[PDB]
């Protein structure tokens, strides 16, 4: 019966994953650093670098988005809006 807060959590998570797509592609990270790639250990540094940046991106967005949702009580508010909408159509 409650769907709105879940739509919000899902599309936010969707939007985050889509935004770092071109950072997950080892080909884009290979053409911003063409010469650094050709090097043996430059490859090893680049690959560990994207892992750590993707990690930082996921953990910070996770924590900061949930903080926002709690501060603004959005789950409760969206649950009550679902109730009001469902009650109107009953």
């Amino acid at each position: 019966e409650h769907i709105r807060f879940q739509r919000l959590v899902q599309v936010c998570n969707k939007a985050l994953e889509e935004s770092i797509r071109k950072l997950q592609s080892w080909e884009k990270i290979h053409e911003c650093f063409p010469n650094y790639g050709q090097t043996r250990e430059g490859i090893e540094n680049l690959t560990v670098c994207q892992q750590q940046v993707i990690k930082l991106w996921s953990n910070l967005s996770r924590v900061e988005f949930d903080a926002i949702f709690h501060e603004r009580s959005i789950e409760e508010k969206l649950n009550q809006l679902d109730d009001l909408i469902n009650k109107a159509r009953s």
Partner: protein, 96 residues
């Protein structure tokens, strides 16, 4: 479909204008974006010499190009998010 009437009512229910939530989201992801591109350049610059060549130059321009690519992805995807949220989440159907 949006009016000043429906938005004002949703504002009373939320305790704040609907767009303040979207703004917080977008402002948060743009801060995180620049933390990530900044960490990337810091990680690579620490490791800017390999063998005998100095890639300090290619690193700074290369990270500047990836930041521009992320700005465009972030801008594209969260513009979609903004629309969806205001149409399917922070919205009152036509029952009014």
């Amino acid at each position: 479909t949006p009016t000043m009437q429906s938005t004002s009512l949703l504002t009373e229910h939320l305790g704040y204008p609907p767009i303040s939530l979207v703004d917080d989201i977008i402002n948060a992801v743009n801060e995180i974006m620049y933390k990530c591109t900044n960490a990337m350049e810091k990680y690579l610059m620490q490791r800017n010499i390999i063998g005998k060549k100095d890639f300090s130059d290619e690193i700074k321009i290369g990270t500047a190009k990836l930041e521009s690519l992320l700005e465009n992805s972030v801008d594209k995807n969260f513009d979609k998010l903004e629309l969806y949220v205001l149409r399917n989440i922070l919205s009152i159907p036509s029952d009014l």
